[PDB]
RNA sequence: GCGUACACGGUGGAUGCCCUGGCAGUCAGAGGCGAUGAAGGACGUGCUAAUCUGCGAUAAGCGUCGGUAAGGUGAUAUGAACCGUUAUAACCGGCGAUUUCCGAAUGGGGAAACCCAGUGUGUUUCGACACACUAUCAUUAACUGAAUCCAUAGGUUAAUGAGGCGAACCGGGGGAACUGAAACAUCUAAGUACCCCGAGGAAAAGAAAUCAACCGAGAUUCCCCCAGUAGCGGCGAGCGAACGGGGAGCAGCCCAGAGCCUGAAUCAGUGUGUGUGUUAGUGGAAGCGUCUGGAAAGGCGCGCGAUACAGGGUGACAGCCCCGUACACAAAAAUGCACAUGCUGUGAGCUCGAUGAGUAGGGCGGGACACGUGGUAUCCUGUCUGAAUAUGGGGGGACCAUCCUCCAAGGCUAAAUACUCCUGACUGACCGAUAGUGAACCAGUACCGUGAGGGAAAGGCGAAAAGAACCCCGGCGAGGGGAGUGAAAAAGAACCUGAAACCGUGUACGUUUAUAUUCUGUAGCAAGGUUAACCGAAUAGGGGAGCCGAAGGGAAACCGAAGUUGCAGGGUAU
């Protein structure tokens, strides 16, 4: 998890992080507004993943 | 490290449970321990129509300090102290009073 | 708008007295130094 | 006066003014008051010498002072000191000697009822606190030369 | 046997409720409540509530024969001040 | 209708238990931070109604390396929902990335958390998004550069200082009224508060042209005595020295120009390895039975460990309940303290020379010099004049003689030293919510004054919420009663123990520390004692520059005395 995505090229990291922040964030916010997503650890894991992927692309390259 | 952890057999030295043995289920962050069938309480829980209310008075277990319960070993049948030692590649707890191996 | 003109934070800071009074006010620790 | 070493049947002679001088209650009271106050008050060497001589003489007359040729433990273990004290039936005693012994000091460290201190660091409070005092001939002569 | 019924922190003047209760002091509970039914005083409602609660407690826990129940010890005490509040107490038994 | 006393009540907190609180000290670092945006705020970030704390749209966090790792996901303060459980759950530490807006706040405006922008680059699209820059003063360097050829003023660029705050110390320049002589003159208050500058954490100064004079001490820096002596003041209140004499430390300097032999020790910067700390942690001793008691940690009996009976708490008082302590160990990477270690610049010692020349001094005009030249003074002016130089000067009682100093107009010198806004640890013949901090509590909060400023009161359920399930009355409320938990509910969330004052019922009856002076006792020694400051694994012991008595008295012709220092006690002088 922490190191599985480290070796991948920057292009796929950019693609996955942009797709996640564009789709999963909207899905989770709409679910929370509508009362869905009874389990909240999805928010934690997705926020941590997006933060970790965005932490790269600045010091790595 | 904690001298008492999961899957450990203990006997309550005092507190209305003298001489009775049990297995520790969970330990609270404040130092409390949970052992099945040593201290049963009569919590007057408030009935609620949702959340699958158990019904009536719930006979659950309360939380008691770890200090009030000692560790039990089957080698001699009497509670004894425990220290920590270094094994070939790890550190493990070893009882006292002839150093029974866990 | 008179309150902003008179007791405005920038207006007070424009003078040395404003800086010293706000510094000692913070030293005291009031939640609102001026308003 | 003359004292018995109780270990070799050897009699040792000491200055009369030290172990044979009259007990001055006022001097001892003043010294203990000054010690408690300091625990700023003027302190004089002559006052200290008089107080120590008076208390030593009183203890000798009360048979509260007993001397040995040497007091030590072969190994730095408190059990050795405890058993040695039990052999003589001594529980509340003040061990006083000259050069500090590492083994004896280590053994007596935990013992609340037994205290170990150097000859130069002797104070009346330690002498009065414990029922009896165990010293050594070397310590006795060291104290005698200190008091002159 | 004895029956107790009391109300805490009643928002009424203590002296007024004491005077109202003095009217029914030393009187049968049934007669007291019958007389208090038509009473127009504000404390009339409070005394009616306390007496009905007393008889309800008696019949639920104590024995029967609540009609012969008698008023024994009725009083009011001054309460905390925030119009001073009052505490009403009624002890009733047939004997 | 009331009173004489008792029991129950309610606003009620005298008393007592301490605390997640303050206050006074001791030992150490730090003794400043930042344009690479200091300090502090505004708003957000939890499954959130709210708070502390962390963080900043990558938001109660992320990448790396170590310790631990089976419970944790921070708590208040529960619930829902999660991962993994022997190394990719979670926690601590170092190294890195981000870090919204205001805030010196720095692109401009402006009303603090607000608005409006421009330039260049990337955009795999050029709607629009991300990044860097875009203020002022001063200095250095480079390129351009009018009057005026060059050079300057001016312009562009690279670099450096400052945009502010911070408790105290240092020097310099000004600086008050209150002030005692019952007011007041010379004065004290006071050079205190206050205003400014410089930058140091310590500062300045720091090594004699020093004082007496015919003997003498020899850097600067602080300290008790001399000493409240002289001296100063309607000699009254009051102020107030040293030459000189002892402790901390005592290191001096250099170049000031010429060379000789020279990269000969030292300095600042930069690698290597050694040892100890900072920066997560590891191990680490030992007990039962009866009785009592809600529960033992109360005590009775016999045991074990103790380098550890320091301490914390655990149903009442614990060495053997544990956490801990003594003690022995521990760092992947970062970091201070001293070493041998390679290198870049300074760079040893020897001899020969001057001794910092418009300089000392002098003339006409002030400053504060208690005193306006009067009994009268120091750095100098606006300007001029004007010394031999070490063989000479300052000079010293001026002098002859004799004596100290400099070798005359460069500054450097950490040492012994004042203080804590803040950081780390320890202690309290210090206090206990009307005390202690204003604030032990969501306290510099509420609140008041449109600002300065002032400023509160408000804590204790139960060891364990295990919070009175349930049933009934009641209005589906509030409130109460049975039952039950709970040691106790004469412990019930309006919850620590709980006296009355006030009001009702029934019961028996009638209607100022501190500086001196004197006297008291007591204790050492003795013509002696105390030693000051300081040293001192430390009130031990040393250490009398320093105080008085003193085989002395007396007229140094002559004859031949027992006082001091501590303790407690009192009166007096402010």
- Domains of chain E in start order, with CATH, are 1-95 (3.90.470.10)
Query: Would you say the C-alpha torsion E58, E59, E64, E67 has a positive or negative sign?
Result: positive
Answer whether E74's CB lies under 8 Å from E91's CB: yes
- Which nucleotide has the shortest C1'-to-CA distance from E84? F11
**Number of C-alpha atoms within 13 angstroms, CB side, residue B75?**
13
Give the three-class secondary structure for B9: strand
Q: What is the DSSP letter of D24?
A: -
Q: What is the residue whose two structure tokens read 């007070």?
A: C12
Number of domains in chain C: 1
From the list B102, B91, B89, B97, the residue with the least C-alpha distance to B7 is: B102
Q: Is the dihedral of CA B68, B71, B77, B80 positive or negative?
A: negative
Q: How far apart are CA E11 and CA E19, in angstroms?
A: 16
We report the CATH number of the domain holding residue C27 as 1.10.287.3980
* Integer Cα distance of E75 and D69 in angstroms: 90
Nucleotide nearest to B41 (CA to C1'): F466
Cα E7 to Cα A60, D72, E18, E50, E75, distances in angstroms: 75, 81, 14, 7, 11
Token pair, residue C35, equals 């308003």
What element of type H or E holds D107? helix D102-109
Question: E35: burial class by Cβ within 10 Å (0-12, 13-18, 19+)?
Answer: middle
First to last CA, chain D: 16
Distance between CA D25 and CA D32 in Å, rounded? Answer: 11
Resolution of the deposited coordinates, in angstroms? Answer: 5.9
Total Cβ atoms within 10 A of residue B97: 13
Residues D78 and D81: their CA atoms lie apart, in Å, by 5
According to DSSP, residue D101 is labeled: P
- Nearest nucleotide (CA of E89 to C1'): F9
How far in angstroms lies nucleotide F304's C1' from the CA of residue B98? 14
Decide if E23 contacts E76 (C-beta within 8 A).
Answer: no
Distance F541 C1' – D12 CA (angstroms):
26
Length in residues, chain A: 61
- Name the closest residue (CA) to the C1' of nucleotide F565: D44
The nucleotide whose C1' lies nearest the CA of D111 is F309
In 3D space, the residue among B55, B97, B63, B48 whose CA is nearest the CA of residue B77 turns out to be: B97
* Assigned token pair, D24: 């001055």
Give the Cβ contact number of residue D63 at 10 Å.
8
Nucleotide nearest to A2 (CA to C1'): F88
Which positions of strand F lie within 7 Å of protein CB atoms? 9-12, 40, 46-48, 58-64, 68-73, 75, 80-82, 85-86, 88, 96-98, 103-104, 110-112, 164-167, 282-288, 294-297, 305-310, 313-315, 318, 320-323, 326, 429, 438, 443-446, 450-453, 455, 463-464, 466-475, 477-482, 484-486, 494, 502-505, 522-525, 529-531, 538-542, 565-567
CATH code of the domain occupying D2-147: 3.40.1370.10
CA-to-C1' span, D148 to F131 (A): 89
Query: Please, how many CA atoms are within 13 Å of residue B68, restricted to the half-sphere of its CB?
Result: 16
CA atoms within 13 A on the CB side of A2: 0
E21: exposed, middle or buried (C-beta count within 10 Å: 0-12, 13-18, 19+)? buried
Q: Which residues contact A55 (CB under 8 A, 6 or more apart)?
A: none
Report CA(D21)–C1'(F388) in Å, whole number.
86
Q: How far is CA B41 from CA B18, B27, D47, in A?
A: 17, 18, 71
- Distance measured from the CA of protein residue D44 to the C1' of nucleotide F231, in angstroms: 39
Q: How far apart, in whole angstroms, are the C-alpha atoms of residue E57 and residue E3?
A: 7
- Which structural domain range is residue B60 located in? 1-102
End-to-end Cα spacing for chain C: 13
Contacts of E94 (CB under 8 A, 6+ apart): E1, E65, E66, E68, E69, E70
Measured CA distances, D52 to A1, B35, D95, D134, D139 (Å): 79, 64, 16, 15, 14
Distance C26 CA to F401 C1' (A): 79
Instruction: Determine the longest span between alpha carbons in chain A, in angstroms.
Output: 41
Q: Give residue for tokens 């797709």.
A: A19
Which residues, listed in sequence order, are joined to residue B65 by a DSSP beta bridge? B32
Residue E17, number of CB atoms within 10 A of its CB: 24
How crowded is the C-beta side of D79, counted as CA atoms within 13 Å?
Answer: 0
CA E63 / C1′ F379 distance in Å: 117
D31 — phi, psi (to 5°)?
Answer: -65, -45
**Can you give the distance from the CA of residue E94 to the C1' of nucleotide F259 in angstroms?**
137
Gap between the Cα atoms of B79 and B96, Å rounded: 10
Note down the domain range covering C8. Answer: 1-35
Q: Which residue is nearest to nucleotide F79 (CA to C1')?
A: B51
**How many whole angstroms separate alpha carbon D2 and alpha carbon D140?**
13
Contacts of B100 (CB under 8 A, 6+ apart): B73, B75, B76, B80, B94
Protein CA at D140 to nucleotide C1' at F522, angstroms = 31
Residue B44, CA distances (Å) to B36, B50, B53 in order: 20, 17, 12
Sequence-ordered list of residues with C-beta below 8 angstroms from that of E70, at least 6 positions apart, any chain? E27, E28, E29, E92, E93, E94, E95
Task: Please report, for chain D, the start and end positions of each structural domain, with discontinuous segments joined by +.
Answer: 2-147
Distance, CA of C20 to CA of D3 (rounded, Å): 82
Of B35, B58, B39, B33, nearest to B48 by C-alpha is B58
Return the beta strands (E) in chain A as ranges. none
């Amino acid at each position: 998890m922490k190191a599985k995505e480290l070796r991948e090229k920057s292009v796929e990291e950019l693609n996955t992080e942009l797709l996640n922040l564009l789709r999963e964030q909207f899905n989770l916010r709409m679910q929370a507004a509508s009362g869905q997503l009874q389990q909240s650890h999805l928010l934690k894991q997705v926020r941590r993943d997006v933060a970790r992927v965005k932490t790269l692309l600045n010091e790595k390259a | 490290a904690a001298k008492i952890r999961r899957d450990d057999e203990v006997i309550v030295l005092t507190g209305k449970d003298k001489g009775k043995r049990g297995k520790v289920k969970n330990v609270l962050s404040s130092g409390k321990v949970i052992v099945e069938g040593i201290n049963l309480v009569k919590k007057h829980q408030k009935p609620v129509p949702a959340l699958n209310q158990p019904g009536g008075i719930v006979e659950k277990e309360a939380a008691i300090q770890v200090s009030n319960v000692a560790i039990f070993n089957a080698a001699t049948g009497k509670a004894d102290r425990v220290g920590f030692r270094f094994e070939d590649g790890k550190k493990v707890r070893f009882f006292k009073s002839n150093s029974e191996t866990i | 708008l008179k309150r902003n003109r008179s007791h405005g934070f920038r207006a007070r800071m424009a003078t040395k007295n404003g800086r010293q009074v706000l510094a000692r006010r913070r030293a005291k620790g009031r939640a609102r130094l001026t308003v | 006066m003359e004292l018995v070493l109780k270990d070799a049947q050897s009699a040792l002679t000491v200055s009369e003014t030290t172990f044979g001088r009259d007990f001055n209650e006022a001097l001892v009271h003043q010294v203990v008051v000054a010690y408690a106050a300091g625990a700023s008050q003027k302190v004089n060497k002559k006052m200290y010498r008089g107080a120590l001589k008076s208390i030593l003489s009183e203890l000798v007359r009360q048979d509260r002072l007993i001397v040995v040729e040497k007091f030590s433990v072969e190994a730095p273990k408190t059990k050795l000191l405890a058993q040695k004290l039990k052999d003589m039936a001594l529980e509340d005693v003040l061990i006083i000697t000259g050069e500090l012994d590492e083994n004896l000091f280590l053994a007596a460290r935990n013992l609340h009822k037994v205290d170990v201190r150097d000859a130069t660091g002797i104070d009346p409070v330690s002498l009065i606190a414990f029922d009896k005092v165990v010293m050594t001939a070397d310590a006795v002569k060291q104290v005698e030369e200190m008091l002159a | 046997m004895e029956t107790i019924a009391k109300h805490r922190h009643a928002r009424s003047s203590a002296q007024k409720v004491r005077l109202v209760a003095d009217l029914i002091r030393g009187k049968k509970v049934s007669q007291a409540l019958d007389i208090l039914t038509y009473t127009n005083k504000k404390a009339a409602v409070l005394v009616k509530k306390v007496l009905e609660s007393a008889i309800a407690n008696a019949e639920h826990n104590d024995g029967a024969d609540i009609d012969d129940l008698k008023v024994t010890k009725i009083f009011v005490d001054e309460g905390p001040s925030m119009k001073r509040t009052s505490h009403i107490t009624v002890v009733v038994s047939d004997r």
